[PDB]
């Protein structure tokens, strides 16, 4: 192989099932909890997060949606990308709520920071948690995951790959070199 799987189908649907109980666990149940997707993978995370949530306690959570393109500010390979929101879909009110951001692989931070702006532009929260299905590491802001279903560690030469039904026809999280 040129890949390594550091989630396979399982896995993830194991890693879900716990941050979903992790998150009733935190808040002592989902009374004005709200969960938002960061970008097309963490959108699909969070609705099955959801799914796993009404399971668990017969009360149904909102999702949310934030949608974010990451660019270089030159030709290099740099992990330092700025964050452009594009669009914003949440069904609720948020301000007084407890926002959970879903977020696929935490890496920098640069994609939480804007997903947070991004929130502060639609109301007032009286918190904002974060949810990573993997944290691979290397930080470039001061941003820390409540939720992890998986620490990766990770170079800056490698890249996660993550794979969903939904978007691949596979659920698995891969690593590879280069
Ligand atoms: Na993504």
Redesign the pocket.
């Known amino acids: 192989q040129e890949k390594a799987v550091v989630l396979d189908e399982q896995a993830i649907r194991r890693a879900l099932t716990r941050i979903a109980h992790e998150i009733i666990e935190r808040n002592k149940g989902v009374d004005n909890c709200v969960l938002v997707g960061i970008?097309?993978?963490?959108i699909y995370l969070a609705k099955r997060l959801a799914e796993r949530i009404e399971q668990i306690e017969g009360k149904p959570v909102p999702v949310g949606e934030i949608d974010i393109t990451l660019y270089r500010d030159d030709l290099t390979v740099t992990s330092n990308k700025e964050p452009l929101v594009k669009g914003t879909d949440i069904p609720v009110d948020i301000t007084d709520k407890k926002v959970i951001l879903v977020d696929?692989?935490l890496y920098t931070g640069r994609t939480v920071r804007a997903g947070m702006d991004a929130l502060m532009d639609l109301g007032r929260p009286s918190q904002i948690q974060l949810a990573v299905l993997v944290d691979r590491g290397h930080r470039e802001l001061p941003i820390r995951a409540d939720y992890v279903g998986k620490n990766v560690p990770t170079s800056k030469s490698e890249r996660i790959v993550?794979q969903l039904s939904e978007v691949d026809g596979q659920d698995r999280v891969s690593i590879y070199e280069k």
């Open positions: 970008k097309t993978r963490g696929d692989v993550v």
